[model samples]
Target: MKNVGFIGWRGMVGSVLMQRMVEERDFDAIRPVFFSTSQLGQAAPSFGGTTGTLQDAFDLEALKALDIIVTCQGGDYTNEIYPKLRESGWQGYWIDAASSLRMKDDAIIILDPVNQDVITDGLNNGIRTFVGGNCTVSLMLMSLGGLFANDLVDWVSVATYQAASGGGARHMRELLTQMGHLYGHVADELATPSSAILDIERKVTTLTRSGELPVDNFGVPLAGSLIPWIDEWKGQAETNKILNTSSVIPVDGLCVRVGALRCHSQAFTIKLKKDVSIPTVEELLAAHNPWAKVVPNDREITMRELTPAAVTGTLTTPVGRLRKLNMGPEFLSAFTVGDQLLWGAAEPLRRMLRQLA
Candidate 1:
């Protein structure tokens, strides 16, 4: 029997994770303990359970009281405390939503997915740390995973349109704030039928360019604008790593932050080793995971289904706009969208914690 304790379920990702747990009623089967860095001794969430005061997250002895620690608390919490627990010989599973321990040898990136056997082998072999992967990486593998699994892919390069949530919850709020400021500035002209569209554009443009918009979280307007791929952002590398390919089939790309609230979309250019037919490609991808669907390539279907607007909060990730690029039969192009917080982040950790019990 396993005992699982939760920490930092108050943040955006954590909030969603707990909501997911509640949806599945995973809490009903287990006697869960809630821990807090700031709310220790406070009453816990009223979700159905044996209730008690929140426990201290920083207190290591309190931590050792469980068989597992599933923390959606950020990296600094993991970085500071996990080591001390190990030093003190705490032998328990650490299922974390943080990236701090992800690239290390002792921890396996948990998606229970494209890397299913990888996770099974690690877990069966006593791997202790369960870390969810980078948001972009998980989505890529989930959407296009079959190609990698079938060994039909020679290489991949994607142009990602990541949403505000990847940066964090405050970033999405800032994005909306920037959008509000832009619209309010042109509210008069925007409401007028005879308004010159250029005039309204110029008004919003001036505000976005000047300091009239909020840039605190995104460092610029992601409301009317976008930021180009940059970061040790971990997309290219992590996708390769999760594929269990220290010898990755050469995945490369730049990430672009777009205006979506919580979904991540990617335009992929895949180089298949053989000239595989389009239907075969679709069949392989759809068979990879239950939530992954091979959306019909028609323009209407693609427009309606393969966009962040339709996919933002759903587990359904549609891969569409698929076809062989004019370059060659070996060249394939496809588009897909997924919720950054779901398969991209929380679902992985949730699944791991669920089966552990």
Candidate 2:
């Protein structure tokens, strides 16, 4: 079995990657070694191979002994350790969930379903480092891979309704805490179904605006409100990078943080190279990926299937609300929802490790 070391498997994205790896019976193919930055010699989880006690995550010699290394250990950890390991002449396949090596010319972005050709070329040409793409970009391609695969897009604009989990596990907890406090303040009125709606609204407004909500992680209350901006990284740049198209297409958009937990929803304006029928567009999306589901333009179906509530824990990436915009027959409007932690983050990292196996 190929020796594979798993690091940061206890954190949010790392835990999700570990969960998927276990479900896929990956341990049978690889001799798994679990590592921790702290808690040296602790009992390893019973699943997977019994390699026993946790290894020191920082030990370069131990990591260099492995045939492959996979980590969701954040950018700080990667930034500190990866270069040192490489400098020591370790050429193991480094698959990371962090963004540190993503933009490096030699590090290939691994989104196998979307860019299998690029990955194949990279591997054949002796590339060893692989990095996951931004969450919004990965999920966008998972939902809309067909359009890009067919070379039909001229350009695209996206507006993201991202979830708290995208920020991190701590942010997810902060959002829930804010929700509790907000609900606790208005619980009485909410319990009394016939209570004045304006009364509850007033209390909610007052509490939200009173500078009392926990704003430490989010910098503002995101429970009853939305943040109009996200991190400054260019979502379009990551999208095109993973697509690896010869002609760089324009991708522009803003991201908003909403009250949802882990599912991110997006509204898109796509400029197609030519006019295409709505049925053809649907066919293209559904055929592009196993998880790229196409929801009909029906209002009820879109609401039922293309929502964060419907997609938070599933692999389903459903794209809906697709139609020609008022701008012209060549312009389209589309909406998609996906689990930010799944396709957006963890799924690709684990799958890339599998490819090496």
**Which has the greatest lDDT?**
2
Q: Could you tell me every candidate's TM-score relative to the true structure?
A: 0.96, 0.97
Give the per-residue Cα lDDT of candidate 1 at 35. 87
Cα deviation in Å at residue 321, candidate 2? 0.2
lDDT of 1 by residue, 1-357 (tens): 466788888889989998998898878766688888786899988564667789998999988888889888899999999999988999899999898988888888887767878888898898888899888878888898888888888888888898989888898899888878988898998788998999889988888889977788777778878899544354556676677774667777788999989999999999998999999998999998887888998888888888898998888878898899999999999898999999988999888887777
Residue-level lDDT tens digits of model 2 in 1-357:
898898889988988887887899877888888899788899987568574988999999899999999998889989988999889888999998888888888899889999998998999999999999888888889999999999999998889899999998889999999999889999988999899989999999999989888889899889988999775254666777788878888888788999999999999999999899999999999999999999999989888899988998999999999999999999998999999999889899888888898
Q: How does model 1 score by TM-score?
A: 0.96
Candidate 1 ranges with C-alpha deviation above 4 Å: 230-234
Clash total of candidate 2? 0
Backbone clash pairs for candidate 2 read none
